[PDB]
Amino acid sequence: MESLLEKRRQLSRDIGRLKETYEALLARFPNLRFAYKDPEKNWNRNCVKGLVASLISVKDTSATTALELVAGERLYNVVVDTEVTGKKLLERGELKRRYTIIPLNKISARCIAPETLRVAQNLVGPDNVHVALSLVEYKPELQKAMEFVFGTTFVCDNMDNAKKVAFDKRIMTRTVTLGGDVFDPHGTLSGGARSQAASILTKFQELKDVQDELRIKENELRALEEELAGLK
Amino acid sequence: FKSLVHDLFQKVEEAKSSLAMNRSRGKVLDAIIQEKKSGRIPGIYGRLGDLGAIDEKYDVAISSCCHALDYIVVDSIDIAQECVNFLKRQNIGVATFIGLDKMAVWAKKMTEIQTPENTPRLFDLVKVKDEKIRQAFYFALRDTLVADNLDQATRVAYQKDRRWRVVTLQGQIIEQSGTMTGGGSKVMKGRMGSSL
């Protein structure tokens, strides 16, 4: 019984510490935060999943900069359940800045075909070309959003291979290099001098780890408190 | 209240980010234009937005939905690669370049169309001299529609037999993908070269 009471004190302490860390991080990087006012009474906060970058984890950290540029602005896109939710958010959510919302029920994208990756692999070598989506981990319920952000672009090792893959007539697919050069088969190239400072993705990850541990402890404590209440 | 404090952090951060990104964009463009003027890099035109004009009524719309207005038009991807190398070697910054030769695929694709609720197609509102540049604008804008408000946008985007890309006069966007863009007090404007 006292062990349960001590466990409750321990969980409460960790939760307090984690919330403080969470708030410190948001203060240091306010772009990591997405806030909105409930657009309705009895608002199900589960309808809003959050910023794309808060919902993924990089599998291959050598591709961190490439993945950052694959997404671009879409790291800060907001994933929600429906376009209905999205409209309410835009209208009634009191957003403090401009956001692009991804509605899971409507979002649509042409994923890279297996045959297309095949061709790219034979063209530049399977070590040197990957579908961006294969390099991020995320919960399955977010599949359609992540296909949209990462499933339509290749990540290649260097500019020469990226160019060869992007503009191959059998492929015609957006490609990004490890250095963050972006080839669009429509006929554009984006690149230049990029900072070697830590990718914003590392900061999202650092915040995600805190959010994840916080969620587990808050759930642990809620359950423990339910049962403590039951002793009476 | 902590949400009030963080709202202020966020606003401060947005101001800082806008300032920095606007200066960086201007710095990169001026560097590229010096390479054009000096003749050290041939085949550079300039930013796409300087090559078109649009009625002031649509200033916010096209400024909000056409990132390509800040792309730098050059003759080819080869010249784009020379520019990107230049930017890297002198640690100047980043830009997006349009290979104008790639734009020719749109040459016969620009004819006027019937649109949902007879909304204007934004591309048709852009006044251009050169036909190659007009092709670049079609690349940039395609069949983007202008709606009067977000309700009409949702109607023309989602509710027809087909999906359409639509921007509102206030600068909100619905993409063919399904995404919806808006929020905040900050308005994008002035990204087109004139108001002819």
Side-chain angles (χ1 to χ4, degrees):
Chain A
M1 171 53 183
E2 173 61 34
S3 73
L4 287 175
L5 283 171
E6 188 72 2
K7 184 57 180 176
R8 172 171 190 259
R9 289 189 289 267
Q10 172 136 329
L11 285 164
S12 293
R13 173 185 96 238
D14 290 350
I15 289 159
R17 180 186 43 80
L18 288 165
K19 288 183 169 168
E20 216 83 343
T21 302
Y22 188 104
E23 281 152 30
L25 285 164
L26 295 188
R28 175 167 327 204
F29 306 108
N31 41 326
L32 298 186
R33 171 177 179 258
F34 173 66
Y36 66 95
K37 167 176 158 298
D38 292 342
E40 290 175 351
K41 239 86 188 208
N42 299 323
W43 178 244
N44 188 357
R45 300 224 169 108
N46 291 332
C47 294
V48 180
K49 309 304 186 183
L51 304 175
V52 164
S54 71
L55 306 165
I56 62 179
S57 181
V58 171
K59 288 163 60 172
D60 184 352
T61 58
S62 66
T64 302
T65 293
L67 286 170
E68 175 175 359
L69 265 304
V70 165
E73 211 177 64
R74 294 183 176 155
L75 292 184
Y76 304 99
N77 282 15
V78 179
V79 178
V80 306
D81 59 354
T82 65
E83 86 282 3
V84 161
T85 301
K87 202 177 172 188
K88 298 170 175 186
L89 224 43
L90 286 180
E91 289 184 314
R92 297 159 184 81
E94 283 297 352
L95 306 186
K96 296 314 237 272
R97 47 189 289 266
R98 185 183 176 83
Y99 287 97
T100 293
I101 298 153
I102 290 168
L104 289 172
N105 78 323
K106 293 294 183 158
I107 195 62
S108 190
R110 185 166 153 210
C111 282
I112 289 173
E115 180 44 43
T116 303
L117 168 65
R118 248 160 216 141
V119 176
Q121 289 173 319
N122 294 336
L123 200 64
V124 297
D127 286 340
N128 303 322
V129 57
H130 297 91
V131 177
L133 187 59
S134 74
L135 306 175
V136 296
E137 180 78 25
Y138 54 88
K139 297 274 288 298
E141 61 160 357
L142 309 174
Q143 176 74 15
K144 299 181 182 190
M146 300 301 169
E147 280 170 359
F148 169 70
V149 174
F150 298 106
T152 64
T153 305
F154 287 117
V155 170
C156 289
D157 65 328
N158 62 38
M159 273 198 33
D160 294 306
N161 284 338
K163 180 176 179 176
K164 292 164 61 166
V165 161
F167 291 108
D168 193 283
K169 319 83 213 176
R170 291 160 303 166
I171 303 175
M172 289 296 120
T173 297
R174 191 169 174 261
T175 64
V176 181
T177 69
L178 290 177
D181 308 291
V182 181
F183 287 95
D184 188 301
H186 287 105
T188 66
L189 169 67
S190 319
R194 308 196 176 271
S195 180
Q196 286 181 86
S199 175
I200 193 62
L201 283 180
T202 63
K203 300 311 188 297
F204 272 102
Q205 176 68 63
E206 177 175 353
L207 185 69
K208 186 175 185 302
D209 291 337
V210 170
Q211 300 178 281
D212 285 342
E213 186 181 343
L214 185 56
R215 172 187 311 108
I216 293 168
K217 312 275 215 195
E218 288 181 324
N219 284 342
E220 273 191 277
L221 177 60
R222 201 187 330 273
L224 172 54
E225 283 192 336
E226 260 158 11
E227 293 195 73
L228 279 172
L231 303 187
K232 331 153 184 199
Chain B
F1 161 76
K2 108 157 194 178
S3 56
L4 225 47
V5 179
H6 274 91
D7 284 353
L8 205 136
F9 292 156
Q10 193 139 41
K11 282 170 168 181
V12 162
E13 187 64 16
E14 211 75 5
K16 282 176 194 178
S17 170
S18 282
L19 273 168
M21 269 308 98
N22 289 336
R23 290 192 298 271
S24 178
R25 183 178 319 301
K27 165 188 193 61
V28 170
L29 182 57
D30 289 346
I32 296 289
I33 294 312
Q34 158 68 199
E35 298 304 303
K36 168 194 184 176
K37 286 166 49 171
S38 65
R40 288 186 292 271
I41 306 187
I44 296 167
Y45 293 71
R47 76 186 285 278
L48 178 63
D50 283 354
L51 291 160
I54 194 165
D55 191 306
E56 197 158 84
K57 181 193 167 77
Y58 303 106
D59 175 20
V60 171
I62 193 169
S63 294
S64 302
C65 79
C66 189
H67 304 112
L69 297 184
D70 287 318
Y71 297 176
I72 296 179
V73 179
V74 295
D75 268 333
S76 61
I77 297 300
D78 289 327
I79 304 307
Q81 285 180 267
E82 209 179 322
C83 289
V84 167
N85 174 73
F86 158 77
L87 292 179
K88 279 176 181 172
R89 303 299 180 183
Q90 287 179 227
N91 194 33
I92 291 166
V94 160
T96 297
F97 300 86
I98 296 167
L100 188 59
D101 62 347
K102 305 296 194 177
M103 298 301 98
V105 294
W106 301 110
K108 270 64 184 179
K109 292 289 213 161
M110 293 181 295
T111 64
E112 306 208 343
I113 56 169
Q114 181 177 288
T115 61
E117 304 186 5
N118 298 319
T119 46
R121 179 173 72 157
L122 194 47
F123 164 81
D124 297 316
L125 298 172
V126 179
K127 269 70 199 170
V128 203
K129 269 255 234 167
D130 176 78
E131 190 68 12
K132 286 185 189 179
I133 302 308
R134 196 168 80 101
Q135 293 165 0
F137 274 111
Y138 193 73
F139 153 80
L141 292 168
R142 304 284 295 272
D143 294 335
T144 300
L145 307 177
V146 186
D148 174 86
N149 61 62
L150 190 53
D151 292 327
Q152 181 176 38
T154 54
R155 222 156 51 232
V156 302
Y158 289 134
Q159 259 60 31
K160 315 306 177 178
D161 44 279
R162 191 213 112 167
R163 287 200 185 171
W164 299 77
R165 181 175 199 254
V166 55
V167 61
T168 68
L169 292 173
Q170 302 72 32
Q172 304 136 310
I173 304 162
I174 306 184
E175 295 280 3
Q176 283 177 288
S177 64
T179 64
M180 304 164 34
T181 302
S185 203
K186 188 180 297 186
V187 176
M188 286 174 277
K189 57 181 308 158
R191 307 181 62 253
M192 275 265 287
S194 37
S195 315
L196 265 57

